[PDB]
């Protein structure tokens, strides 16, 4: 996965209105109970999906079962563990646990370790302090591969989309209910509000009409249109700034 | 004792708290080692999780913290075997087991 969530264009998990009268519906609290049911069940499923993993010629034949399940140890690294050929991760875990039992870190103070006799014999070194990075890096060198035989001589996204679309339809029905409910509560200051706001919206939608293709190429913008007042008044300002 | 109280809040950190340690860290994988046929760094959440776990390890007298930290160390030791910055990190939790 990524670090940031993926930006999508479709809505997801819209709100539920709480201003609806519960004396007639009596179902929004039950829908909230279903939402918290789904959240608890998805919480348990997410915790389970996270916890579910946490001349004499020689005969040589490249075998079919050459796998990385049993990879050969060096004889120096084998006597430090005890197993002959166990794994590739169990060797590193056993070396780290052996150092943790020997308490070689401290009695950097944790990077450099105290070299014991076996830790010098398996690494062919002679230093006293050596970092755990260079301890672990040589483990890939000390492990040899297995030699062959040598003989010598969905629907959930669309469902959530449908639920989100139906919740948006519910939000539309709730807002259209709330507008008529406020108009039933007060009839005076909402019709003057309509006559103001719809007039301002018509003035905004009628604010882009003198900038068309065949309207600007003609001369019925500049000539004799002193009633427009939008343009032909800033020619004394744009000339003083050099915009021309 | 308030945080490790209920049956669903004290079991998330049984698996997510080791999972946030080796987060956004290029751990050495083993599928390429099994299908033949090291990061040297940390992340932003890793130091915060290590500091939170080390301060959680200061629960003395075997209370609600020390009973929790004994079931997590065999799983955190599997992550310390692969990431050598996790040897320098988690200093106090290793001294307090």
């Amino acid at each position: 996965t990524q670090t940031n969530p993926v930006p999508v264009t479709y809505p997801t998990d819209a709100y539920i209105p709480t201003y609806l009268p519960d004396d007639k519906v009596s179902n929004l609290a039950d829908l909230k109970k279903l939402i918290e049911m789904d959240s608890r069940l998805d919480l348990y499923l997410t915790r389970r999906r996270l916890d579910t993993s946490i001349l004499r010629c020689s005969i040589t034949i490249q075998l079919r079962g050459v796998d990385g399940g049993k990879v050969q140890y060096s004889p120096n690294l084998a006597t430090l563990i005890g197993m002959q050929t166990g794994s590739v991760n169990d060797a590193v875990y056993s070396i780290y646990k052996y150092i943790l039992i020997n308490n070689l870190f401290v009695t950097p103070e944790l990077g450099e370790v105290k070299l014991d006799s076996l830790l010098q014999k398996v690494l062919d070194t002679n230093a006293a302090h050596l970092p755990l990075m260079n301890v672990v890096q040589t483990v890939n060198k000390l492990v040899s591969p297995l030699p062959p035989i040598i003989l010598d001589y969905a629907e959930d996204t669309a469902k959530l989309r449908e639920i989100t679309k139906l919740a948006l339809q519910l939000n539309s029905s709730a807002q259209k209910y709330q507008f008529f409910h406020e108009l039933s509560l007060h009839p005076r200051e909402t019709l003057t509000h309509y006559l103001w706001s719809s007039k301002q919206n018509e003035l905004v939608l009628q604010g882009d009409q003198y900038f068309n293709e065949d309207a600007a190429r003609t001369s019925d913008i500049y000539s004799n249109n002193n009633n427009d007042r939008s343009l032909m008044g800033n020619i004394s300002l744009l000339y003083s700034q050099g915009r021309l | 004792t308030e945080l490790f109280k209920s049956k669903e809040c004290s079991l998330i950190l049984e698996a997510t708290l080791p999972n946030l340690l080796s987060y956004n860290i290029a751990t050495p994988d083993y599928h390429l080692l099994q299908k033949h046929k090291f990061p040297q760094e940390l992340s932003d959440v890793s130091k915060v999780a290590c500091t939170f776990l080390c301060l959680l390890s200061n629960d003395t007298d075997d209370g609600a913290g020390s009973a929790f930290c004994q079931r997590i160390r065999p799983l955190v030791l599997h992550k310390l075997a692969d990431i050598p910055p996790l040897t320098l990190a988690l200093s106090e939790y290793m001294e307090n087991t």
Partner: peptide, 30 residues
């Protein structure tokens, strides 16, 4: 069950490391 498996497997690996340390006591006498 996961606690009871790990608390025996760690003791088995400790016993294997102790036997691997005791092999040196037989190698130093030869």
């Amino acid at each position: 069950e996961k606690l009871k498996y790990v608390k025996e497997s760690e003791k088995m690996l400790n016993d294997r490391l102790s036997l691997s340390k005791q092999i040196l006591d037989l190698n130093k006498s030869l």
